[PDB]
Design a protein around this ligand. Structure first.
Ligand SMILES: N=C(N)c1ccc2cc(NC(=O)Nc3ccccc3)ccc2c1
Length: 246
């Protein structure tokens, strides 16, 4: 997250921190995710497509720092890694950038909700917020495009949704951004999501309900003029999510 503010997991309790174990024992941070039900985390296929082995991943819920075992956190392995079959990547645009992770503790249990571990509601079909609505993003991603390290403490920011007609303007993304994608940015271009925030949540309060409207997917640079963040429009994928979690 470029700009924004430092936060803690009690403010983002649906946030999942996903890591990968490498041969030799080293563990590195991969992507964010969101808890949609006790046994299921939703994220972005691009986070996993190059290492599609469920045994490699570690998922934490209730974790506020990259390298602290936060009090109340719970650690899980991935029982099933579901990637979208029509996922693809263009120079900028990522298509069907959505994945599901079925989680299990060593004792075989799913998440136990608590003050720091909670689900986030899915949207309803054909009901996304109007352009100009403010939404929040959360993640352990870069603080500046030139950084190589990720922040130790979790961050959040707030951005505004941009219409498809505006996002398709020539100086924006033209025809590269589709109706299955949602744009969101800062009007002054000072805050945004960035590398390492992928898979994380774009949460919008709509009709009084905190909703998982988007999943961080792609963008040209981070916080660049006329280059919004692009998110998987979760409402389009409700049939896919429902069928893959039954
Ligand atoms: N402007 C944004 N909101 C945004 C959102 C997600 C992003 C994700 C990025 N991920 C990215 O470039 N990943 C990568 C890693 C190794 C080799 C090649 C590429 C980079 C910029 C991003 C920028």
């Amino acid at each position: 997250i470029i700009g924004g503010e430092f936060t803690t997991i009690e403010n983002q309790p649906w946030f999942a921190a996903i890591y990968r174990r490498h041969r030799g024992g080293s563990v590195t941070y991969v992507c964010g995710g969101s808890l949609i039900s006790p046994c299921w985390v939703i994220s972005a296929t691009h986070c996993f497509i190059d290492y599609p082995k469920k045994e490699d991943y570690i998922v934490y819920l209730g974790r506020s720092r990259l390298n602290s075992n936060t009090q109340g956190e719970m650690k899980f392995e991935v029982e099933n890694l579901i990637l979208h079959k029509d996922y693809s990547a263009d120079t900028l645009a990522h298509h069907n950038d959505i994945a599901l992770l079925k989680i299990r503790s060593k004792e075989g249990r799913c998440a136990q909700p608590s003050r720091t571990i909670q689900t986030i509601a899915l949207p309803s079909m054909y009901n996304d917020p109007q352009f100009g609505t403010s939404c929040e993003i959360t993640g352990f991603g870069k603080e500046q495009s030139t950084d190589y390290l990720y922040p130790e403490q979790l961050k959040m920011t707030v951005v505004k949704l941009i219409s498809h007609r505006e996002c398709q303007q020539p100086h924006y993304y033209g025809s590269e951004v589709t109706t299955k994608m949602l744009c969101a940015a800062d009007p002054q271009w000072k805050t945004d999501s960035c590398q390492g925030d992928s898979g994380g949540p774009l949460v919008c309060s709509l009709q009084g309900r905190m909703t998982l409207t988007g999943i961080v997917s792609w963008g040209r640079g981070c916080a660049l003029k006329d280059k919004p963040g692009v998110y998987t429009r979760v409402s389009h994928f409700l049939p896919w999510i429902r069928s893959h979690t039954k």
